[PDB]
Amino acid sequence: SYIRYSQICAKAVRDATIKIVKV
Amino acid sequence: DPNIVGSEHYDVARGVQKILQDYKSLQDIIAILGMDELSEEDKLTVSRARKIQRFLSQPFQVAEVFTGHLGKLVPLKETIKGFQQILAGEYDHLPEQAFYMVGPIEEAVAKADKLA
Amino acid sequence: DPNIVGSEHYDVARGVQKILQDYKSLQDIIAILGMDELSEEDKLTVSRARKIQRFLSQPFQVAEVFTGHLGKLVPLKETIKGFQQILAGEYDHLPEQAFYMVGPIEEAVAKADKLAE
Amino acid sequence: FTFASPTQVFFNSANVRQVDVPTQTGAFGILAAHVPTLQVLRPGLVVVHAEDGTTSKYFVSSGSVTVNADSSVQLLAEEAVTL
Amino acid sequence: KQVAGTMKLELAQYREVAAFAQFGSDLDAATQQLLSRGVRLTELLKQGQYSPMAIEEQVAVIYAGVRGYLDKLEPSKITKFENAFLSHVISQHQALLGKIRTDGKISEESDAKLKEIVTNFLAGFEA
Amino acid sequence: ATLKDITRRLKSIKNIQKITKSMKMVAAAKYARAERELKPARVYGVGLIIGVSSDRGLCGAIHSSVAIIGVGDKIRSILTFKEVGRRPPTFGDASVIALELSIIFNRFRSVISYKTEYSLANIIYYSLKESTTSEQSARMTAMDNASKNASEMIDKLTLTFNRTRQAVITKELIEIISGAA
């Protein structure tokens, strides 16, 4: 997915709350 | 006392009383916030208790002018049965005012039909 | 009075009283909104105040039948030091019931190990 | 031309000459008259050529660029910082 | 009369919002300021037993805070500030306190004299 | 009925009233933060049943209006995403929702009135930003109404306190007169 790719690019560019509930 | 009036009579009587005391405890939070701020457990007891309150009321034959309604005389077995069904959750879908000023449990259903 | 019991003694006494009085106003919040609403600074003072409440309590040597375990006498210098340590946050890692019904602060440390296994 | 991150908005419906944009396949310089296309971005710089000839340099990590049937472009990134 | 009149109003503005201090890190910036001025002025009114202060010493310590020099200073160390500030002015500026007392007022010269003291004292203290 | 019981009750409801009035200004300050950040969010997000709410209640008819997925722990409470409303919703939160995987949320109008690829996460972000601005302003009114209800309650108890205070004075006085006569 592109979302996973997009957030990885977000982590690198910042170098310059919700939790998972599954029944 | 279960030894005198029967085990079914006593349990229903104490059931009616338990839910009314539970409803009386929430009265403060209901007045401050609202019924909508209660949990799903509490909202269910509140709706049932409010229906039990009204089903406790009764039109009297002496008050045939003060109300304009018909006087109602309800047998014991039918009185026990009526409250027992509300406690077990059989009339949860029915509106509150249907239980207000009625005779037996059958009239609470028949009153709800007119409001449909 | 600082000029009687010492300035060290006096300041701990007022410090213990201050955090317990501040906790009382915090108790008014957690009664309605709950523990989840408090700030990280708030629940730090609450945990300390609750530990101080329990450390004020001790088993009496005439009350063997009521508390279960024997009573013990605590020296003054160890009493000032004990509460002083809790106010500094030296035992924020120790559990709450470790301070309940014990003698000096050394017994609270030993009880903390006994609650694990 | 609209350029915005979740944090701040850089341009609101320009009114601009051309914008250099990083795209998965190399780079695209979108002129006022450009074909209607939908493209996805990659880690690269955005160069905004202002209508008075001046230049604006920002950086983009990822996002999308949308140019419609008319002369309208909406560029949006996840983060855009200077410098 | 000069420093009290300002303090009276600022503490009254505080009491109308003081009952909402438990959330005092989530309100509007305007009310947060009233909370800050309130708590600092309160800490100034705290006094030790058997040690009453002369009027000229009182007005000088209230002057700090009422002019806003304690606003960006930790509430716990306001008392430690006061005792040191009072000890310094008693030792170094006997003439100033002596002038406030004799004239019975705050002259513009004494106001400026106090301003240079507190500003430079603050920077040394907050370092 | 005793003065002690009324004095205790007065302080009990006064504590509620002070807390609810303290949350009216909080939900006024947080709403101001939420609307300031909604302007750049509305211009960002333009181009299956998803319910958007929060874990934090006390916001009136917001959770009841919206009628696996489901963001906001109070929406699963009727029949999942948890830990929202406590802090303002970031894009990363809207990303995680899209990562795990036609949308219902409350759109902000004013303080009184409401209505109930890469692009998919942007809609989730748009709903999250719109929901918390709606959640906060509705909480502002909810606690304002609760602060009115608690104040009316204090007023009724104060009248009881004054009747009981008068009653105790007279009762003490009769016990003295009778004891003398």
* Domains of chain D (ranges, CATH numbers): 1-83 (2.60.15.10)
Q: In degrees rounded to 5, what are phi and psi of residue A20? A: -75, 125
Cα of E4 to nearest chain F Cα, Å: 29
- Rounded CA gap, B111 and B116, in Å? 9
Helix (H, G, I), strand (E, B) or coil at F82: strand
DSSP state of B35: G
Beta bridge partners of D59: D45, D81
CB D19 within 8 A of CB D29: yes
- The angstrom resolution of this structure is 2.6
Does the beta-carbon distance from F43 to D12 stay under 8 Å?
yes
Which chains have 3 or more CB–CB distances shorter than 8 Å to chain E? Answer: C, F
Return the bridge partners of D19, or none. Answer: D30, D48
State the structure-solving technique. X-ray
CB contact under 8 A, D6 and F91: yes
Residue numbers in E near F26 (CB within 8 A): 23, 26-27
The C-alpha atoms of residue E118 and residue E61 are separated, in whole angstroms, by 10
The rounded Cα A9 to chain-centroid distance in angstroms is 9
List the domain boundaries for chain E: 1-127
Q: Tokens 């036609």 map to which residue?
A: F102
CB contact under 8 A, C29 and E22: yes
DSSP annotation of D26:
S
Other Cβ atoms less than 10 A from the Cβ of C112: the count is 16
From chain D, pick out residues whose CB is under 8 angstroms from the CB of A10: 61-62, 78-79
Domains of chain C: 1-117 (1.10.1140.10)
Calculate helix-pair angle for E78-92, E108-125, nearest 10 degrees: 130
Asked if the peptide bond before residue C20 counts as cis, ω within 30 degrees of 0, the response is no
Q: How far is CA E101 from the centre of its chain?
A: 18
Contact (CB, 8 A) for F100 and F21: no
CA–CA distance, B27 with B41 (Å, rounded to integer): 15
Sign for the CA dihedral angle at C1, C7, C12, C14 comes to positive
Contact D38, D64 (CB under 8 A): yes
CB–CB contact F15 C31 (8 Å): yes
Q: How many CA atoms lie within 13 A of D45 on its CB side?
A: 9
Strands D55-60, D80-81: pairing kind: antiparallel
Q: Is D64 within 8 Å of F119 when comparing Cβ atoms?
A: yes
Helices (runs of H) and strands (runs of E) counted in chain C: 5, 0
Going by the DSSP 8-state scheme, the letter that residue E73 receives in this structure is S
C19: Cα within 13 Å, side-chain hemisphere: 24
Cβ-contact F109, F116 below 8 angstroms: no
The set of residues, in sequence order, having a beta carbon less than 8 Å from that of B44 and lying 6+ positions away, is B89, B92
C-alpha–C-alpha distance, residues A16 and B8, integer Å: 75
> E1-127 adopts what CATH topology?
Lysin (1.20.150)
**Residue numbers in E near C1 (CB within 8 A):** 49
Contact assignment for E23 to F26 by CB distance below 8 Å: yes
The span from the CA of B107 to the CA of B103, in Å, is 6
Structure tokens at E43: 């800490």
Q: Using CA of residue C54, residue C57, residue C58, residue C63, what is the dihedral sign?
A: negative
Separation between Cα atoms, residue E90 and residue E96, nearest integer Å: 9
Cis amide prior to D15 (ω within 30 degrees): yes
Contact status of F157 with chain B (Cβ, < 8 Å): no
Q: How many CB pairs under 8 A join C and E?
A: 5
Give E98 to chain F, closest Cα distance, Å: 47
**How far apart are alpha carbons C48 and C91 in whole angstroms?**
8
Q: Map residue C60 onto helix, strand or coil.
A: coil
Amino acid identity of E119?
T
**Residue B41 CB-half CA count within 13 A:** 2
Using the Cβ of F48 and the Cβ atoms of chain D, whether some distance falls under 8 Å is answered with: no
